[PDB]
């Protein structure tokens, strides 16, 4: 039974060789097809159009809120005072 276990182990070695060959061919052919075929100038515009359509069709999302507490309150008060005080600001004033 252990010999059958090593038999499955060599089957796994064949699987490993299969994985290596498949990975090599996949990376090589994908890289060449994307650096040679789709490198046409119109392909950039086509990809941009598809990306715009994809960003259009997606569902809307929620976004908010666009450093100490006392410092923040003081900055807000100063900003309010500036806004209430700069009414008579001149071009050179």
């Amino acid at each position: 039974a252990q010999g059958a276990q090593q038999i499955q182990l060599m089957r796994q070695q064949l699987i490993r060789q299969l994985r290596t060959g498949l990975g090599a061919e996949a990376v090589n052919k994908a890289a060449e097809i994307v650096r040679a075929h789709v490198a046409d100038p119109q392909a950039q515009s086509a990809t941009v159009d598809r990306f715009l359509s994809e960003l259009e069709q997606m569902a809307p999302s929620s976004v908010v809120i666009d450093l100490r507490a006392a410092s923040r309150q003081s900055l807000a008060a100063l900003v309010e005072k500036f806004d209430s005080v700069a009414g008579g600001l001149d071009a050179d004033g």
Binding site: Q8, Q12, L14, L18
Partner: protein
């Protein structure tokens, strides 16, 4: 033989099934690291003891949370980390797969066999931290263990 042909057919089925999709998620930056630990800036939707990913394929766990920094520990290889990387939250508490196929095999703590052959058919994955049974759910002990 035909077994290798079927393996290639399954590989092509994976090829005829790959469809990457854009999704919405937040990122972060590694301020500093060393000695197997690292710090992350921003990323405000993190969770205590939540898993996060790294560019090189390694995984990290958030231990403590400062108001403007996140300290994390690197699990596996840590010599491929430098300042300026990109991190991604998984939005899920750390979990381990479980199945009956695990019998008779040796695995790393994460759950990937290192010495065995093939893979594991795991039906479910469960969270690592849970709650112990209560007193009302227990019973006395009488059977022997020779």
């Amino acid at each position: 033989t035909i077994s290798a042909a079927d393996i290639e057919g399954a590989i092509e089925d994976y090829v005829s099934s790959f469809s990457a999709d854009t999704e919405r998620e937040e990122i972060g930056t590694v301020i500093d690291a060393g000695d197997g630990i690292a710090h992350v800036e921003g990323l405000p939707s993190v969770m205590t003891q939540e898993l996060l990913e790294f560019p090189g394929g390694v995984l990290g766990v958030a231990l403590n949370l400062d108001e403007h920094s996140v300290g994390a520990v690197i699990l596996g290889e840590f010599e491929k980390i430098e300042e300026g990387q990109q991190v991604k939250r998984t939005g899920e508490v750390l979990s381990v797969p479980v199945g009956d196929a695990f019998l008779g095999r040796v695995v790393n703590p994460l759950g990937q066999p290192i010495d065995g052959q093939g893979d594991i058919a795991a039906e479910t994955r469960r969270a690592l931290e849970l709650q112990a049974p209560s007193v009302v759910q227990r019973q006395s002990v009488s059977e022997p263990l020779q």
